[PDB]
Amino acid sequence: GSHMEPARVRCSHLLVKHSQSRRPSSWRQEKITRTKEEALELINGYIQKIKSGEEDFESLASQFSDSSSAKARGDLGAFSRGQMQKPFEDASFALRTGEMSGPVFTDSGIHIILRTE
What we know:
This is Peptidyl-prolyl cis-trans isomerase NIMA-interacting 1. By secondary structure, this protein is of the alpha+beta class. The chain has a four-stranded antiparallel sheet, sandwiched between helices. The protein is built from three helices and four strands, in the order E-H-H-E-H-E-E. It has helices at residues 36-52, 57-63, 86-94, and strands spanning 9-16, 75-79, 99-105, 110-115. Helices cover 28% and strands 22% of the residues. Strand 3 and strand 4 (110-115) form a beta hairpin. The longest helix is centred in the middle third of the chain and has 17 residues, at 36-52. It has a single domain (1-117), classed as Chitinase A, domain 3.
């Protein structure tokens, strides 16, 4: 449980679009043909690889993420409350230091939350 309230939290994020997304295009893909489930498979794939030791969230959040933060390894840096979407932000505070959350469904699509701090 959360035994402390931090005003500064650092979390990295990964995002994969889906067919029902508002923007069916990205800075890497021309059209998002993959739906929720197809994107979810990728999400779980990334997570499994990281937990196994195949790769680290750095490469996934950079070369396998649509998040603009991908250029910075997918990290958002140290942010505060009222800075990110509630499902993500509230989850970040709920997570512990060094915790990688699973598939979190948000506006854009499925998000992976890695709370480093």
